[PDB]
Symmetry: D2
Subunit: 445 residues, 4 copies
Amino acid sequence: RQGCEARRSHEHLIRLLLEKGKCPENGWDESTLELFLHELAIMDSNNFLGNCGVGEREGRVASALVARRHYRFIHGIGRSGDISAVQPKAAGSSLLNKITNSLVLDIIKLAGVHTVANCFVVPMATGMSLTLCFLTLRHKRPKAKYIIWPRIDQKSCFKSMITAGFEPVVIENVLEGDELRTDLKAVEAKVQELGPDCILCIHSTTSCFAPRVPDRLEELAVICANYDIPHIVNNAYGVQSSKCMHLIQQGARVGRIDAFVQSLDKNFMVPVGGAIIAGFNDSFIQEISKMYPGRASASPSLDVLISLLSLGSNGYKKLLKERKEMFSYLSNQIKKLSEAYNERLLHTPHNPISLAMTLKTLDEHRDKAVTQLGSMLFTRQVSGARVVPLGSMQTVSGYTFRGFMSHTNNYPCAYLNAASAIGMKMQDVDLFIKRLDRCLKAVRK
Amino acid sequence: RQGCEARRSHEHLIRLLLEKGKCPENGWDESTLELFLHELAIMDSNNFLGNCGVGEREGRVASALVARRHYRFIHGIGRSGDISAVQPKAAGSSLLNKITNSLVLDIIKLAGVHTVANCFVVPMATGMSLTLCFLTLRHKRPKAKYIIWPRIDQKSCFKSMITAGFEPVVIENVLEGDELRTDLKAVEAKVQELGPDCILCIHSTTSCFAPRVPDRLEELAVICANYDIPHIVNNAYGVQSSKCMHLIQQGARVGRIDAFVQSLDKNFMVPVGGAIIAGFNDSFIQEISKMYPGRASASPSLDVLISLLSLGSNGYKKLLKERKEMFSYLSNQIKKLSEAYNERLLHTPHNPISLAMTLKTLDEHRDKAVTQLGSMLFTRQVSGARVVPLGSMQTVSGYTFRGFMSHTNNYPCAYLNAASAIGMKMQDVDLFIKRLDRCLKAVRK
Amino acid sequence: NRESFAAGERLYVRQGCEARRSHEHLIRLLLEKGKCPENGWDESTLELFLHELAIMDSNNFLGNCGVGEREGRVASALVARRHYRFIHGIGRSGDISAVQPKAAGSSLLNKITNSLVLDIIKLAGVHTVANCFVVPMATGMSLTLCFLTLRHKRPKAKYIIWPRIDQKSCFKSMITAGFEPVVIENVLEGDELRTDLKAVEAKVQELGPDCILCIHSTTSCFAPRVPDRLEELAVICANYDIPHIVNNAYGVQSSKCMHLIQQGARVGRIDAFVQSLDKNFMVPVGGAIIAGFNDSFIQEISKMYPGRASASPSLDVLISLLSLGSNGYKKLLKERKEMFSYLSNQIKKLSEAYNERLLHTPHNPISLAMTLKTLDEHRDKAVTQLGSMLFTRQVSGARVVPLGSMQTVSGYTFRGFMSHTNNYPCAYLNAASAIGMKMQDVDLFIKRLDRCLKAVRK
Amino acid sequence: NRESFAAGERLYVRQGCEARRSHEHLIRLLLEKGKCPENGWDESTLELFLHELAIMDSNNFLGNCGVGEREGRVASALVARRHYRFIHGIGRSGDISAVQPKAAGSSLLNKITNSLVLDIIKLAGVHTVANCFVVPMATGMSLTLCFLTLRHKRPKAKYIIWPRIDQKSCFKSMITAGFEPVVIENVLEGDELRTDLKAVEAKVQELGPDCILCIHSTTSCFAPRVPDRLEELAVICANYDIPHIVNNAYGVQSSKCMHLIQQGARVGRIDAFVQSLDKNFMVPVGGAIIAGFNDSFIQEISKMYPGRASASPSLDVLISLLSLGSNGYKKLLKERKEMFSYLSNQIKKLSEAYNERLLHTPHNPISLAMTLKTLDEHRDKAVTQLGSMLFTRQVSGARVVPLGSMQTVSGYTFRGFMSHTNNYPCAYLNAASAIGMKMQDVDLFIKRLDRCLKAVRK
RNA sequence: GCCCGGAUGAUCCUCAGUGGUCUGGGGUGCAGACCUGUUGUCUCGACAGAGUGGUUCAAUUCCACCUUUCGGGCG
Ligand SMILES: *Cc1c(COP(=O)(O)O)cnc(C)c1O
Ligand SMILES: *Cc1c(COP(=O)(O)O)cnc(C)c1O
Ligand SMILES: *Cc1c(COP(=O)(O)O)cnc(C)c1O
Ligand SMILES: *Cc1c(COP(=O)(O)O)cnc(C)c1O
């Protein structure tokens, strides 16, 4: 009786989640999290005790390892002709989906975009979620053939436009200092050259590898509002960046943003394979949702549910704070290391996540040193250290890129990337710095 | 030393899997399965001990519940511009993907289509996987606008064509007996009316609700070979059906089949959200693969890996045998129950999975009895008992269906569905029969 | 059942929340009658029930602060999760059976477990059992706890009368308790070794009832030995007023062993009978059950345990019996008999082909023996090298018993050890049908014995 | 380290397979030196290691057939998986420390665990410890096993000399073993109750050394009592040739308790010291450690255990120490001291505001007491109703000790029970800084005591 | 004057934090002696960013001025 009244303490955390839909401020104990998950899972028809199933999709599970690791959630999210709809044969999974979308909406606000109207989790990654946006827009703009796209050398967001069946119009960037930024003149020149009606959307990018910086979203959103063109923003890993989220918030204030897309793994530290589509026009975000054919995985949504309830909005905020500190620390360590090898930290103040160290002192043409550096870093187990040499030609779905991975035809120098992304620890920078040192010292030869 | 030599017995089951790529004949013990999974997971860079990560996608995991339930597989499958490629930052997950595709290829052979050339698992469900097929074909057939589609009242495969941005041409079916079958005359009439060049593909269906039966794939594949039109087959839940798989095997022998698509949950008893795309032209199946933008979830692939290694090809074969027996048993029980209520089992010999019992004795117009029946069955926890009344109009993405859910404008009677799908148990039929009885007896009023 | 609940829902989250009621009916039924379920619970009901219990324990409370030395803090999540967050053990430090106010959930787990185990003991053959409790010690230490309890009732006692069985744990259990085992040799009656009742009485008379702590008999054992004559020994004990403690280590699985305990208690005196958890319920090693017919004496043994004890063995058997259900357990019991028939018939066969025979031991319902008279050990050491041969080919629990093996256990020296007598006529091989044996087990055994015997032929 | 392995890979599945080598180095190091890792293992290394061990056990063999009665068959997958498929317990039935040939993996788990625990005992203060073993009984039964072992060495002994501490388990442990506790009252020296050494000797002399089984002293205890004077008692024991058994239930966490055991052993005689696993290592209740300085006597206690024992407590502490590492344990120890300072300073404060005081008990490094002289219990029963008040508001392990509580434990009647003397001057309240206490624990406690005291003011 | 029930969470239950999306803890129930001004991110019932005039992206009530005032100058 002291405990059956102490169970009330759990039930109250749970009631609070379902009533107001926001993140817990402080993370739930696992005991509460798992109790909740079990409460939901037994709401799905496949877990009923007196159930019989005479259909073709009944959520039957052949292996107990599979049923357990998914907390007995088998029916996925949505129904046949709506990914947004309650599934009567899975009441528990449907509530799971509603709660996750509502938590993620809360975190998108807390992270910067306070005026987001609606969003939903979609169990495909960011590139494919961008594609779903483009496929939704086709029906709205049946005459459109082109997507105007300020260049960023990332194969997934590029292919997303081609997979959707449109032609990307690659707008090269302008080099301002060390930074590569949006060529606003060319974007509007192209809008006028091709004609608004022939434009499906402008496709911009906020999170990206230095020396590129987040696109000028405010200006681009003004162009988009003026010419009545849809604006789609690739916010692949920018939820973690108050600067990135600011732009989106501001771009929607000054102008037009139809949807912005985010990755779950890059922003929430869960496995790869999910994304969020969010926007400001409520009915439109619903339209993208209703364009998804069939049911989908509940796995990315369960990971996000589990992570945000465990972290709480305080735990998430702490991760974001720690990311800013590690950026400075990484930045200062790159500064110090570079100076010793007569290189420098490229000046890229407008990129809040990514950094670049020059590699001018390595000769790729004669000693292949730049490429060797990337190998040595990889065999010495440094992960995510993107090395970028000059003059790489690369073909991606037909389109040829000169100076590929550098985001422009002729960047001044070869360089090396490093980033401070959510969840990085001091050990990461120190090991990176130490091992980059050993590598440089060795390429001197 | 007796055990360090008994560990060799595990390592040998594992070597055999990686060398020959086929299902174990008899299922692995869990001890072997989990040892293998752990061996692979520590091959991914995120699980290295001396690893440091300075990138934006590092497979960092915030919650231990999430990392454990995925056996520490965080990086998903594929790379940015290839879903088929080895991920150097995730060697273990990549091997996971190769092995799963190779096991699934083995099971597709064992199940009937012995001449399948290539296939791959894609972590989106069947509707969306069909869409990916259509999006791949667009580039091959830039003039095409129409998909010719023998009707089947299922919202997901229908929407798949619209989501891909094509217009479905709905070819009504011919009523032969109680069965609804392909109207081969109309399909060819439409090919000629519209013109082969304007046809993206013919989109046929094998697994479906009675009284529809599997499409005449051999004939359709001959039409497709003749007019040089792509043939895409929706095999949503037909892997479990030797008859269904026969057609595909025969259709490819006599004619043309470019790809056939299957659901993971309906055929392998794992959670919803994955599918297989398979075909006979090796390079084309690779082309569909390379059309996927970005990395994707490894979750559906891990479920399938876990299930097939636990079941073995013998365990899978047993499920298939048991499904045939339960079909007869269900069929005979429906026969007996119906007779008592002056109804009958619709004669649909060509449908190997689904059955239909007539509901002529229930008046939907005046007593709403048909609809009430579906409610009562649902509140009495009968799952998957599709009730189908006459004259339902329904709009799906703009297109209006008369007689929706009946697959034709005017079927003779209202009826009730039931199916024998993989994993069904005698208890399912007996509880279904018992509860359908109570329901009928009660609607008599 | 689900009908009246359906008629109600017929007058969509309502279907689900009212489907939690199904699980609750199963739980409400368990802890209001305390019997095993007829059919096993689904895992979802099982884990639901456990999760509810664990949050009843104070260490899992949400608004909790602990200022004590035993608060149930867990350093490793791997450790906390694998125990379903049950950390406080069973009992209070003054009473292993007392409700722990700091752990209401673990107390409830313990009571329920004892209740289920009582139910099984009844269903298994001893219908008149009065009381029992799970104790997280093996059978050997649980026998010791029985002897430790009897000392206080019989303070002049030094001796425990023990019909020989060559098993080091039950033998040492007497010495650990502080008493001196009086080993009564067995009588060869046919092929089987049985209780020498005259020698027991002769020894009761020589040493004196007041000097005897108890008679310590054994039901489950390895052929050719058979269960002790509990009815006769129960009458000796009743006449001379000597307590009777029965080692029933793996005889819950045998209705012949259990009906023999029930019968002994009907015509005479049995004070407690002790059973292993792992041998009878297929859980890990380390727990036992102490059961009896005098409710208060079983409570006295319980109250003699000093301190708190692990809840791990209680939780293993609670999960197993709820998953199996009484029907599931009965089936396991029915199959054990069937596999016992099959195993002997197969051993009759195999033995014939090697000029050996199945020793006639009908009174033993679990263990069989086959002669190895063919093999010479004095010359070419063929018998002692069949033991390791069977092991190498992974035949577990196949016991090879040579002639004239000498062995010292705690200072006492056995002759013909492993054979329960000093000169059994021949060398032999053991094999048994214990609960959970599958046909594959026997077929594999026969097959490898065949290859092993053929080999020895060199 | 990873450098020379990188230079090698520099002369893509090769990066991975050679990254299994990292885990192997950690494992190769563990079982070749047997020390704790300095830094905790990652879970992936931990679960890799365990999975490897478990398949070394015969029950997990792939080509296995079992024809025995103890084959380690598991009925429930929930049960098998939560124990990492470790089913065969520890030991052979004749020796709890013997390698089980049918369970090579569990044997290796047991040896390693004992080795790690030995390492911790050294790092914790008793650097001269010779040997120890984990035993799956709590501290109470483990004390009993110590007494059961001494009986065989001292067969005329009846008595155990015990400086009083009001805790029912260690007290009953003597009675369960079959001996009669001789309770030596404590001497009030200041605020704290300490060993009455004159009364101990007076009792050794009255009863006679040969009649004493051992002296049973206690280090960890609840204030105002403090650790026994082990050095003085170790000298008494050495002079009169009486074995000395120390109840160190939760004193591994205290370097003052441990350096006091090490010191007692330097100047005199300590035969064994027994520690709880859950109080010192934050694992579930139910295991203990028996340690000593004579290697052979510790082996004799081990060899007195009859049968096989649960491996569950060994596995809990193996997981915890490998996850914590020696650095992780040291940190927990350093933080316990810090929280002990903080807890008293906070209790000094709070007490002042209520006209109460922190009893001066510097010799006790774990437990504190605050007076409750304000509250009248003879009138308005205010003290006995603060106990339940603190409980209701979920203050666990806050002990309220009234005056004149009488209590009967196993027939012996204590006066002033819970206070360790028959008339302590005042009623008081206990609180302690035990390992794993977090600042939130203290702040919450002070806060609710404040509300509780304020309330009582009615 | 002038379980200048600074309950000024009806912007200096004052009368802590940032009806015209919060005039959590605890001067309870069921600048020129008065004056003037002052019902975080980016470089039956119905109608009327401030926890969540139900500047800036009908509810305090269910910057300028005016969980009024101060349980200073003149179990
Ligand atoms: C299973 C099913 C599908 C699959 O739809 P999804 O929900 O996307 O998996 C498509 N068509 C038919 C006929 C089906 O039965
Ligand atoms: C993360 C990333 C994407 C996402 O690609 P997916 O692999 O499909 O998730 C897209 N664009 C950029 C710049 C990215 O960094
Ligand atoms: C913990 C403790 C014991 C042992 O109690 P158990 O339940 O046997 O573990 C004995 N004495 C004291 C002082 C203790 O703190
Ligand atoms: C199992 C058994 C025991 C008990 O051995 P433990 O290791 O103590 O569990 C004792 N006697 C016999 C005959 C047994 O079979």
